[PDB]
Structure formats: C-alpha cells, structure tokens
Amino acid sequence: IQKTPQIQVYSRHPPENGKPNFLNCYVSQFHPPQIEIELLKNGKKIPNIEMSDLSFSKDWSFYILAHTEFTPTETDVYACRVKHVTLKEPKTVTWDRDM
C-alpha cells in the first residue's frame, strides 16, 4: 500500500519581522519511507538545515520534521519542497505566517 505525504509549515515562536526564530516543515502519514525534503528562501535551496529522526505511529505510517534558524522580513518568501513516489512532480508549499 502507498500513502501520499501530508505537508505542514510553521514557526516555533509567534513570528515578528526582524526577530530571530526557527522555521519547521512537518511531513507525515506517508509510505514508503523513501523521501526528499528541502527548505527554500525566495526559490533557492537553503544550505545546512536540520532533520529529526524518522519515526511512525499506531497505524504504521511514517513522520519526520525539517527545521532551521531564520529571521523573517516583509519581503522574503519561505517554502518547503518534497519528492516522493506517489507524486507526479515535486510539491512546493509556502509558509503561512498565521499557523
């Protein structure tokens, strides 16, 4: 059986322009475990991000968290991009500051 990933983007503390914080991309409910994930700043991959251990829940589907330090500003756009067998093309999802 295969299962497409659910993808969610949010920050650790309440966001504020010009203030240091941390950006999270939470990818869950997928199968198989083989997957690719990257964080973007204005369309360009951001280097040296971090990743949690790959784990799983009661129903056997997998989950993991990608994150990095960042300082939001009015004009920069942040996003998360993932590749998986169940996806016909890479899926890019933009950060929503209200989450």
Partner: protein
C-alpha cells in the same frame, strides 16, 4: 485506571536504500517524549534531550545498545529471506513494550507489520509467534531456527521492560512530571468570497493532550479543523481554523484546556 505510563520501542528496516536511509533504525519513548535513538550506520544507542542529564546505573546505556543490536540482526535477515522467495522490495516494522501491574509486574505488547499491514504477533508467556499469511510462515520459521531467540525476546518483555520503567519513574521523576501550558495567539485573515478565516494557535506545550473550543459572544460554537505537530525541542505546537462571516470577527474568542493550566484560558484577537 490512573494515567498508566507506557514504555515503547519503534523498530524498522528496508531494502531500498536509494534515498540514503540506513538499513535498520529505532527510537524509544516514555509516554509522549523520546528518550532514546539508534541506527545501523552508528552502532550505538544514545539518550535524547533532558535524558542526557539523568543519573543512571553505569551499565544502563550499554545494555540498551546490546538488546537493540540483537533485534537488528533478526530484522535484516528476515528481509533477505523474503527477497529470495518473492519479487519486490520490503519494509518491516515492529512495536514492542510494556506497562506496570499493581504488584509491579509486567503487562506486555508485541506486534509486527510488513509493507504497511499487521501480519504477526508474539506471546512472551508461551514463546510463540502467530499470524495468518504466507509471509508469517516465512519469517516465523526463520526466527525459530534458534531457541535462544524466543527466550531472549521473552526476557526483554517480562523482566527488562518493567525494570527500566520502575527505574525511570525513580531517577527521572522530574522529567516525567512535566506539565507546561501553551503560549497562545488568535488571528484573522481573508478567506473565500465574503469570509474570513480565524486561526487559534498554541505554542510550546507538554503533554500533547489539548482541547480547543471557539466561543461566540461567550457561548460554545464549535471546535474547528485542528491538528498538531512536534515543535523541534520536545514540546508541541497546534492550531485550529474556523470560517466566519467577513466583518463579524470581533464577536469570537478561543478557549483551551490543558493539564498545565489551573483552569480554561480564554484568548482574544
């Protein structure tokens, strides 16, 4: 009855390494927090977060590593067997652990799954593996080639588990009693034609059990579409969305219930 603290190990192994995953890895949990990590590209079990500072008997972490290296061999061999009698790739998972009885004795758990579905079980009091699928036989048979296997798996669950659990309940009482309430925010943004979306967000709380309830003029009005996820440092983050009429945003509030709060907390826009 009372909150029964469980200790559980999450195990996995795969054949396809084209995305850089190790062949075998595992994590361990006390309730909702992770205390252990391990993967075959490193050969050692390590503590996580605050558990790095727990006062333990000197052989503790060495024994976790050895019991896990044992499980790694059983799993990887099971994969190669299947890869010989059947076509395709595989993913094998296991969920093992226990809870304490009134007399401090063990209440075990042991289930397995192949490519996403349950296909086997193990009874420690009798030493046998069961299930009803052609693969159940291929694997169970392999694991019965050596009598020590069944005996060691039985000891891990009926002796070791309750022992480590009673030990953490003692040395890590402080971490286990963690009750921290969420920081809250409520905001409005443009929605579909003629509507606004309201988002109630909760930051950095523990344990994960939490309840959202939107209010309109002070009365209950729905729970909204909600979700939760890990926050990066062991704590959790959650949010709930409700669609309302454009212009009536100010009539609404958000209220949450959590173990770390003396009573429900109400939040404003």
């Amino acid at each position: 009855a009372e909150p029964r603290l469980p200790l559980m190990y999450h195990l996995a192994a795969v054949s396809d390494l084209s995305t850089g995953l190790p062949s075998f890895w595992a994590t361990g949990w006390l309730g909702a927090q992770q205390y252990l990590t391990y993967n075959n590209l490193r050969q050692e079990a390590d503590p996580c977060g605050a558990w790095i500072w727990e006062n333990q008997v000197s052989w503790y972490w060495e024994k976790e590593t050895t019991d896990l290296k044992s499980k790694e061999q059983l799993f990887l061999e099971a994969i190669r067997t299947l890869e010989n009698q059947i076509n395709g790739t595989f993913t094998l998972q296991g969920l093992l652990g226990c809870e304490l009885a009134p007399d401090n004795s063990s209440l075990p758990t042991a289930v397995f799954a192949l490519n996403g579905e349950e296909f086997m079980r193990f009874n420690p009091r009798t030493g046998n593996w069961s299930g009803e699928w052609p693969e159940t036989d291929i694997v169970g048979n392999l694991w019965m080639k050596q009598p020590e296997a069944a005996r060691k798996e039985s000891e891990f669950l009926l002796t070791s588990c309750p022992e480590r659990l009673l030990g953490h309940l003692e040395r890590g009482r402080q971490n286990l009693e963690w009750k921290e309430p969420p920081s809250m925010r409520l905001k409005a943004r443009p929605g579909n034609s003629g509507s606004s979306v309201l988002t109630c967000a909760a930051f950095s709380f523990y344990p994960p059990e939490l309840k959202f309830r939107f209010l309109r003029n002070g009365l209950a009005s729905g729970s909204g579409n909600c979700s939760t996820g890990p926050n990066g440092d062991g704590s959790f983050h959650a949010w709930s969305l409700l669609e309302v009429k454009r212009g009536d945003e100010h009539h609404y509030q958000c209220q949450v219930e959590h173990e770390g709060l003396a009573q429900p907390l109400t939040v404003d826009l």
